[PDB]
Write a protein that binds this ligand. Structure first.
Ligand SMILES: CCCCCCCCCCCCCC(=O)O
Length: 170
C-alpha cells in the first residue's frame, strides 16, 4: 500500500553532533511569508496585513528567547509586537506564557533560509512559513501550500509584501 503520504518534512531536532546549535543558528531577522490552516478563520488575523518582519534574540534569562515584530498593515500603519518564548532542554518546541495550552513545533523547510511553524492551541491549528529573505522563490511557497494542504490545512494566505517593511530594531 502506497500513495498515502505527504511530501517529506521533518521536525527540527536537538539530536546529533551540532544539536546545541539550536537556538543560536535561528537568531536574527525573519519575514512572514505565508500561512495555511484547516479554515480561513484561523488565518483571519492576517487579512489586513501586508508584511511582518521579526527579530529573534537571546533572552534576559537562561531558557528564553525575545521576539520582536513590526506589522505593516495594508493601510500603511506599523504595529510593533513583542513576546517571550520559553525553551525546553532537548526540544525545539516553543512555548509562550499565554497560554500553557499552546505550543509551536519547528519544521525544516524546502526553502533555503526558510522555517515552518506548526502552532497548536485551543480549538485551532495553523502552519506558518518564514524566511530570511523577504522574497523567497515562488517554488518554496508552492511547496509549502502543497505540503500543508496534504496535511489537511487547505485554507491558504500569502502575505502580499507590496510595501516596505516597518522599522524594527535588532
Ligand atoms: C528559534 C526559532 C526561530 C523561528 C523563527 C521564526 C520567527 C518568527 C516567529 C513568529 C511567531 C508567529 C507569531 C504569531 O502566531 O502571530
Amino acid at each position: 500500500s502506497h500513495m498515502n503520504q505527504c511530501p517529506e518534512h521533518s521536525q527540527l531536532t536537538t539530536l546529533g553532533v551540532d544539536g546545541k546549535e539550536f537556538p543560536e543558528v535561528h537568531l536574527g531577522q525573519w519575514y512572514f511569508i505565508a500561512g495555511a490552516a484547516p479554515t480561513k478563520e484561523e488565518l483571519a488575523t492576517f487579512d489586513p496585513v501586508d508584511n511582518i518582519v521579526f527579530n529573534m534574540a537571546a533572552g534576559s534569562a537562561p531558557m528564553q528567547l525575545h521576539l520582536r515584530a513590526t506589522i505593516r498593515m495594508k493601510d500603511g500603519l506599523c504595529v510593533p509586537r513583542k513576546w517571550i518564548y520559553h525553551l525546553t532542554e532537548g526540544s525545539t518546541d516553543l512555548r509562550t506564557e499565554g497560554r500553557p495550552d499552546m505550543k509551536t513545533e519547528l519544521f525544516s523547510s524546502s526553502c533555503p533560509g526558510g522555517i515552518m511553524l506548526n502552532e497548536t492551541g485551543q480549538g485551532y491549528q495553523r502552519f506558518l512559513l518564514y524566511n530570511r529573505s523577504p522574497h523567497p522563490p515562488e517554488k518554496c511557497v508552492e511547496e509549502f501550500k502543497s505540503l500543508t494542504s496534504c496535511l489537511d490545512s487547505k485554507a491558504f494566505l500569502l502575505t502580499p509584501r507590496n510595501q516596505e517593511a516597518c522599522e524594527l530594531s535588532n
